[PDB]
């Protein structure tokens, strides 16, 4: 449930990971602006059915996208890359958040605009400006029990958000004395987080300009504080109980990851439904990547001289695992 009443207002190098989900996916993270080209290669030909999940970003304002005898490759193209990079393949508590991003396309009449809604670590709504639907599409397996009037309201509110973002695009362009030829992006995130007894504890409303943290005068006057706090402490938590109860079958299912150890020392875990995991080796830290089915995998290593890989132990810690 989006907030109806809407008060107006550095380049990061991409990192690429390549793997095949079950024992073909390319995970990119830390790349901004959104103008990315990514492709999967080498059955002598390109891949035809290349689709990607929704565009979003973590707390650090930086994006993270995913695409999913023969040898393959992944090619990545971004303005931070003078030369398109190729990477090879080797086989051997609760919270609600809403992320809004609007991108200026210099020349095109309608700037790009998408909105994403997340509960825990799973998205449940989709809206893309360039999409032909032009309506808030669910695409989630636990939200379809709602009625059409709900979706009409969501469409109306998301279009209000679109118009607001279109406006402050030019507003900040004038504020920082930039030109029309350059392309800039505005990002907004708001949400509210509940605990084990299903009541509000925390809330977030942050806003950034092209990946620079901006605000988390007009507003002071505009009396935003009370209404915003009421919305965060109000409609979120009731609706959030509602999605939690209607999404109980999936959202809370605890998944036990399966562990493996290899040396040819890598300790690896797969299929843990929540993202939070810890791996310890009694050391290089890599980012967690999904499997495409909602389950997650991670991995960590220790490098040892020849013959002495036997005196290190990996312990896997998790909310859904009893003992490391």
């Amino acid at each position, epitope marked *: 449930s989006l907030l109806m*009443w809407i008060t107006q207002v550095i380049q990061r190098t991409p990192k690429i990971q390549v793997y095949s989900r079950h024992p073909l996916n390319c995970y990119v993270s830390g790349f901004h602006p959104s103008d990315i080209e990514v492709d999967l290669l080498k059955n002598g030909e390109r891949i035809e059915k290349v689709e990607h999940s929704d565009l979003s970003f973590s707390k650090d304002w930086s994006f993270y996208l995913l695409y999913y005898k023969d040898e393959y490759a992944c090619r990545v193209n971004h303005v931070t890359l003078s030369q398109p990079k190729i990477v090879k393949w080797d086989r051997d508590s609760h919270s609600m958040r809403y992320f809004f991003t609007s991108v200026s396309r210099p020349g095109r009449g309608e700037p790009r605009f998408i909105a994403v809604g997340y509960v825990d670590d799973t998205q449940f709504v989709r809206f893309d400006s360039d999409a032909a639907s032009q309506r808030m599409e669910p695409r989630a397996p636990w939200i379809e029990q709602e009625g059409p009037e709900y979706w009409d309201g969501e469409t109306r509110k998301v279009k209000a958000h679109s118009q607001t973002h279109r406006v402050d695009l030019g507003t900040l362009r004038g504020y920082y004395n930039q030109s029309e030829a350059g392309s800039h992006t505005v990002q907004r995130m708001y949400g509210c987080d509940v605990g084990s007894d299903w009541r509000f504890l925390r809330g977030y409303h942050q806003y950034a300009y092209d990946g620079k943290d901006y605000i988390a005068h007009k507003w002071e006057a505009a009396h935003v504080a009370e209404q915003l706090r009421a919305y965060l402490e109000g409609t979120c938590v009731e609706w959030l109980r509602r999605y939690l109860e209607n999404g109980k079958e999936t959202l809370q299912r605890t998944d036990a990851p399966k562990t493996h150890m290899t040396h040819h020392l890598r300790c690896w875990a797969l299929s843990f439904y929540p993202a939070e995991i810890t791996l310890t080796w009694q050391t290089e830290l890599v980012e967690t990547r999904p499997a495409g089915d909602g389950t997650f995998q991670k991995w960590a290593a220790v490098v040892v001289p020849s013959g002495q890989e036997q005196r290190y132990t990996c312990h896997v810690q998790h909310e859904g695992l009893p003992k490391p």
Partner: T-cell receptor
Amino acid sequence: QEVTQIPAALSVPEGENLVLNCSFTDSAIYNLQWFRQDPGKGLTSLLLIQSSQREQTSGRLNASLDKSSGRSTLYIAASQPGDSATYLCAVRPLYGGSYIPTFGRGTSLIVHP
Amino acid sequence: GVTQTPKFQVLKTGQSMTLQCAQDMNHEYMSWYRQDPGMGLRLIHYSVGAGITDQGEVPNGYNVSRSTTEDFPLRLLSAAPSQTSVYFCASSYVGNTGELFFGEGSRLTVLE
């Protein structure tokens, strides 16, 4: 959702305190507006009450909003002949996505010199 | 403020006339009202963002169209004797405070 104004007709001698009443059926609102209207010349905004405010003041004009009972009262002090006009009460919603206000019928006020 | 033109207009039945509403404080909510004598202040098409327009309670017989967040034209393609009324342009922010702003109004009269 429905706004009614009382008493849609008022006629007083100059210098008398005035009480005007606007009531609404739906209590989940975020706005309140009172507009003067001379026979023509459009609408002039007088007042604005938020969902967080119980009182509002502007010069010799005062107003109170009791959301639980769903009532709003406007107090005019020491009426002058210049206050002869129609007064309109308007409210805007909190949920729905529509942002369409619901205007009342209005109360006409004449103050004899 | 919000300026709407023209102030007065006389139309032969069957003509076409487009009233213009403009503002400079870059509001977002726009709407048209028609006020009838002793009947009420009824609503016409309203638009919340650029490119999106929805119907009100009296949609028949009217065009609107919004491509620029500063202007709003209300066009009558074929004026009718029942169109005789006074029209107001209501402009507002979204979410800022909720205050409305009305234009000076425009009088229309349609004669056979």
